[PDB]
Amino acid sequence: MNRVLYPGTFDPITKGHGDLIERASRLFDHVIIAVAASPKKNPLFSLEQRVALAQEVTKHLPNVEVVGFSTLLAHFVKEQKANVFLRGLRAVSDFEYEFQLANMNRQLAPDVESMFLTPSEKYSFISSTLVREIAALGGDISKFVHPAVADALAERFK
Amino acid sequence: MNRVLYPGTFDPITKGHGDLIERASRLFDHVIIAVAASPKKNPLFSLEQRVALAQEVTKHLPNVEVVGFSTLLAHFVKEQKANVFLRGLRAVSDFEYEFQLANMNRQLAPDVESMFLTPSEKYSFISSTLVREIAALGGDISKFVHPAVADALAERFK
Amino acid sequence: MNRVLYPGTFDPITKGHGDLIERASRLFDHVIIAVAASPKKNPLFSLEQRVALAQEVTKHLPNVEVVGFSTLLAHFVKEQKANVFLRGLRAVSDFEYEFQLANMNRQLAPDVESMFLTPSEKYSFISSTLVREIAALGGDISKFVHPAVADALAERFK
């Protein structure tokens, strides 16, 4: 079978990410949401809290587990025994940066293939960075993230 | 009537912004230059001086108003009773970020329309970030910005 | 006043065009849909039927007029006394062609301003070319175009 690994910051996890997991859960027999620590980017939520948010959003999917890791992505995919990388591609991404990451990871872990999916047309154009800025200014983010994610973001700025 | 709101950092305001304001004043009955504080990017000039610079550059246009705001753009455009967003289109810039911002602003303020303009070929490829870097190294920036902006930047790095 | 001219082939007119006309009617006092003949690309529908389709789709909007023209766009916009060009912005499309066309039109008609709009996320990624190809193979195109356009395309390939 195929065990897909979905790595990302997930700070926070949005409906664009969630729609990708919904499509990935129907496709693969096992989906691993690999929440990366990434302490150099200064995430708003901690690695511990980001894992709990991704679990609440994906608690309805049986073959989906969320794990936090602070090691190299190329080494962690071997430790998780996953053979497929998963990244999202919408009309608002990093087409340049996404190819360098997929190509350089193919040199570190040639057994792991990097495939890309596209979210729904309604949940594209939704970035986690703009979600935090709107949440920091008291904006309504019910359209971009799960209701549980909106609770953490609302509580984070009080 | 049409009351357009042109939001941005304007740190500093350049001839690309000025040409965009010149075209916006000819089209709409009232142009509001909404200078955002944006403390997370560490602006070179303060919000007060960026408003004063945009007023000096646009003092010859009667239907142009400059205001500084530090709140959410979706809330501030409603308080100004503006129904049109204005954003600039050059080379490629962040074609992704411009689409995600316009779409996410359409979810917070669906009544406010996001339109885009393109400056003249003479004032394209002029970014506010590169103006500060050349000014920090003592370079001649009289060609890229208004004479008043060149004075403030010269006073900033001497 | 503001009299916007929306030029294009409209072969056929899609929901992406329709959403753009809906937003243009709310903003400007008069919208002119300038349907171009464009015989070099070999359009599927004639200029007469493309005008009739755009009139049927926009018959509910009072400030919208549909006209067919086979002359230069720069000459026709002057004859219609329009001062604003209107073009659509989706995914990426021909970001190059849109800039060269807007700039070269600014050399032929500098008094006519070229502004760009973006349709809703629901009607983006909808091209007139792919609508004809799916219609030619008997596909269901009720989701992409107006019901009247689906009738003409169905009559075209049966």
Added chain:
Amino acid sequence: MNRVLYPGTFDPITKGHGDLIERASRLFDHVIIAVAASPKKNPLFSLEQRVALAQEVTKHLPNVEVVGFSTLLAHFVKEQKANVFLRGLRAVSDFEYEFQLANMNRQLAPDVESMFLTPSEKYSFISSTLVREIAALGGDISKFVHPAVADALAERFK
């Protein structure tokens, strides 16, 4: 089950396609190379000959089948009972057409998921159109296509 369908013109099939089929064969239990007729593009090789070329290039893979079709891709994928669309992304593809095709196919066949793969850096930047132009001028195309394709192209233009 996972039965992937790889549609394309394959006129002719190149080493960029071949590396994509080899990576798709490692992931899925069955790979279907769906060679489209596309008579409107005026293909260099016929639909029958394009299928025979793709069979020779992929004759070493047991779980790979090549079929030719001249109907709608959404109807043919339903007839093949395939649940995965496959398209290639080499950072020099048609991100515009690829996103419009995947999204509009999601309206015709929502049960079929559109995923994208990336070939190796050595086999990227290889387009079937430029292979025909170099072959038409007597150029050496042994590096871009399979040896069997090089024989057909050499026989085609000599």
Added chain:
Amino acid sequence: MNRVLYPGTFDPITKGHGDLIERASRLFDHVIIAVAASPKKNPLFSLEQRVALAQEVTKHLPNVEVVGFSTLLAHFVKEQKANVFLRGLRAVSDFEYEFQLANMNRQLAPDVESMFLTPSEKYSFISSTLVREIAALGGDISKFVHPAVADALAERFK
């Protein structure tokens, strides 16, 4: 010394192309304007007439010669004993197609390096295709091409 080869259709040659030749003539000791026949694209002007136009535009440059060729570009650069390919890069080009051409030509002629230049900001966004369409509709093309090129285009449509 360096003998640069500037290949292209030049149908017709524009001021964007001319500005590239002006910069190339100051840089290299010898500039060869290689006008390609390209009969499959159906050029407006013949290969014989396109050579005469490029000679009239560049008659003021001593180290610039215009030649017409109907063979492979990779073979013709060896026959011309040129070691540098030259292509233009503006904010309106074919960033995808330009890399495939430069990379695949590096496999056919590894001794010939493909370098890229950028024209002036005023002469960017000027394509030969839009020049012919505007000329075919009686438009004023004095801004895009040399006065001699405007004479041929005006005489061509009478």
Added chain:
Amino acid sequence: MNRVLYPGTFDPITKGHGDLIERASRLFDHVIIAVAASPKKNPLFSLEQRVALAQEVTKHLPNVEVVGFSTLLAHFVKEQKANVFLRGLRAVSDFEYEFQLANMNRQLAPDVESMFLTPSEKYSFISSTLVREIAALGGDISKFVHPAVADALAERFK
């Protein structure tokens, strides 16, 4: 004369840069690798150490000199009496920043021409930022950078 100036951060220098310097050495009589200080980017290696790394990678080329500078690029190129700017384009670069930098540098130093080269397909998609992130996590970066750079990065994060 032709004295090319190759500016960049080189933090660290990669194989994509190295292939670009080897191709630049074949063309010009003298290649100057201008390592910029750039203290605002917080480089991993110091300006002195980045110059020493570029010297070891290019020690086999006689006509290549590496110098460090902390002034404006337009002022330093005048002090070096160089007439050619050199930047790399691998279809995954920063076409936005690269065009804005080349055009605005043409206002500061019009006598200095900005040309672009493309590295091999094997050494494209290699960014200095991703090399540091993989090295910081103990990853194998022997394939992306020179062996001397691999020793420094291994000593830097071990």
